[PDB]
Design a protein around this ligand. Structure first.
Ligand code: FCB
Ligand code: CA
Ligand code: CA
Ligand code: CL
Ligand code: CL
Ligand code: CL
Length: 290
């Protein structure tokens, strides 16, 4: 009675909060259990494909998948569908090609979330000057909309010059180095966007280490303890926080509905909160912080 939860990496406070939500949902019923697995890094795409294939081959009851690539994971998800195994996608989209093969998609509206981050950037930076974009895995499902939404909004609503994008591969240490390097290369940098949890943490640490905290406008994504501290201490002006717990909890609950041959909502927006010093202790923020 296995429900296989497969995420981009287990080495992550973000994915551990998704696990928390999944654990909560599963613990309210007896018939199914979950496994929680992911490769060693978000860039390990082939390893994730192997995990999904293996789940199909051992005939799990259902799969909750945060695909590390929107295209590379399609063949394995098609195999799940051919095996009559319900699949729900969380966090990061699959290609349009795959639409027939899974039954729900729960995620941030990433284009909208990138736009909120860009608007926050402009309101603090203005509309002239240079900003840097620190991204994670190029073309990963959540990344396309998030960074594209950000970038397109900056272009349409300012004459800010974008430096980058740079790609951290979701490695904190890589983001730290890339940020250190962008700062050293661009003395006139007015702002900097870190598009996911590890990238934003490395970014914040780089800014602090460079002696530049508060001397340019930094905006992040996600809401773990490090990022909360960076908002509170003024290193980051804002961080855009997702419904990570909800993706796990409602992800599992959606699969449980499908396993009972019930109707589900195919596209579920798990919401966002832009967290700043002005709202960090409000209930709406506390509900998504972790
Ligand atoms: C580490 C984690 O960061 C979240 O921001 C992304 O939504 C998710 O796809 C993953 O990259
Ligand atoms: Ca313009
Ligand atoms: Ca360097
Ligand atoms: Cl790979
Ligand atoms: Cl999206
Ligand atoms: Cl993806």
């Amino acid at each position: 009675g296995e429900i296989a939860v497969i995420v981009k990496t287990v080495n992550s406070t973000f994915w551990q909060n998704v696990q928390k939500g999944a654990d909560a949902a599963i613990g309210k019923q007896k018939a199914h259990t979950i496994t929680f697995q992911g490769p060693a890094a978000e860039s390990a795409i082939a390893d994730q494909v192997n995990m999904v294939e293996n789940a199909v081959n051992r005939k799990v009851d259902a799969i909750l998948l945060a695909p590390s690539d929107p295209d590379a994971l399609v063949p394995a998800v098609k195999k799940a569908w051919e095996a009559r195994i319900p699949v729900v996608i969380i966090d990061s989209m699959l290609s349009k090609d795959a639409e027939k093969y899974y039954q729900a998609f729960l995620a941030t509206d990433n284009k909208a979330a990138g736009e909120l981050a860009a608007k926050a950037m402009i309101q603090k930076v203005g509309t002239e000057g240079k900003i840097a974009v620190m991204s994670y895995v190029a073309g990963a499902g959540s990344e396309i909309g998030r960074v594209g939404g950000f970038t397109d909004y900056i272009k349409a609503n300012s004459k800010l010059q974008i430096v980058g994008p740079y790609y951290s591969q979701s490695q904190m240490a890589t983001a730290l180095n890339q940020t250190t390097d962008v700062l050293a290369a661009n003395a006139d940098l007015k702002g900097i966007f870190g598009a996911n949890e590890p990238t934003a943490i490395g970014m914040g640490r780089a800014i602090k280490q460079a002696g530049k905290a508060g001397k340019l406008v930094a905006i992040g994504f996600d809401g773990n303890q490090d990022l909360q501290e960076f908002v509170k201490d003024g290193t980051l002006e804002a961080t855009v926080v997702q419904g990570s717990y909800q993706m796990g909890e409602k992800g599992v609950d959606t699969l449980l509905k499908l396993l009972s041959k019930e109707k589900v909502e195919k596209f579920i927006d798990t919401g966002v909160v832009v967290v700043t010093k002005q709202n960090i202790d409000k209930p709406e923020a506390k509900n998504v912080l972790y």
